[PDB]
Amino acid sequence: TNQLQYLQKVVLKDLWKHSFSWPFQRPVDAVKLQLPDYYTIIKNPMDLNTIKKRLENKYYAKASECIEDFNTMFSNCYLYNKPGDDIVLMAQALEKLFMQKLSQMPQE
Ligand SMILES: COc1cc(C(=O)N2CCC(N3CCN(C)CC3)CC2)ccc1Nc1ncc2c(n1)N(C)c1ccccc1C(=O)N2C
């Protein structure tokens, strides 16, 4: 499970420390953001703290399941929001950081 550890102590920790990560450190707050339809049209909401808890709890069976949750977090954000929105620019920078750290994942 060395790929799942790299995802926890490297990929997740490096995304979390990144400047743009705080909007993604909890599930999208539909009350604070005033989004009556968010949890209606976004079928698989995802956030960095959910990924953190699932890694700590050994919820994932293989690295690809956790990687998919990371991708779902980015695509939910692109999907719901609009081109050029601040949050979308933040998602993209975090996704680039995500992809470049997947570059260095031990292929085990
Ligand atoms: C309390 O959490 C946040 C507040 C704000 C902020 O400055 N606001 C929000 C509330 C206020 N409303 C006034 C009335 N207007 C109709 C809507 C906006 C304007 C001022 C900005 C980001 C916040 N945290 C946050 N977490 C996750 C996000 C996300 N943002 N982005 C921006 C999203 C915004 C809308 C829908 C989805 C998201 C999203 O994908 N994520 C990841």
Q: Concatenated DSSP letters for 76-98?
A: HHHHHS-TT-HHHHHHHHHHHHH
Resolution in A: 1.9
CA of 12 to the centre of ligand 1 (A): 22
Neighbouring CB atoms inside 10 A of 65's CB total: 12
Nearest to 15 by CA among 99, 106, 76: 99
Distance CA 86, CA 11 (A): 23
Say if residues 10 and 101 touch (Cβ distance below 8 Å).
yes
Ligand 1: residues with CB < 6 A are 23-24, 28-29, 32-35, 77, 80-81, 87
Residues 4 and 86 sit within 8 Å (Cβ to Cβ): no
Give CA angle at 104 (98, 78), nearest 5°.
Answer: 15
94 Cα–ligand 1 center, Å = 17
Rounded to whole angstroms, the Cα distance separating 40 from 53 reads: 24
Q: Which domain holds residue 100?
A: 1-105
CA–CA gap between residue 27 and residue 29 (Å, rounded): 6
Q: Give the chain's domain count.
A: 1
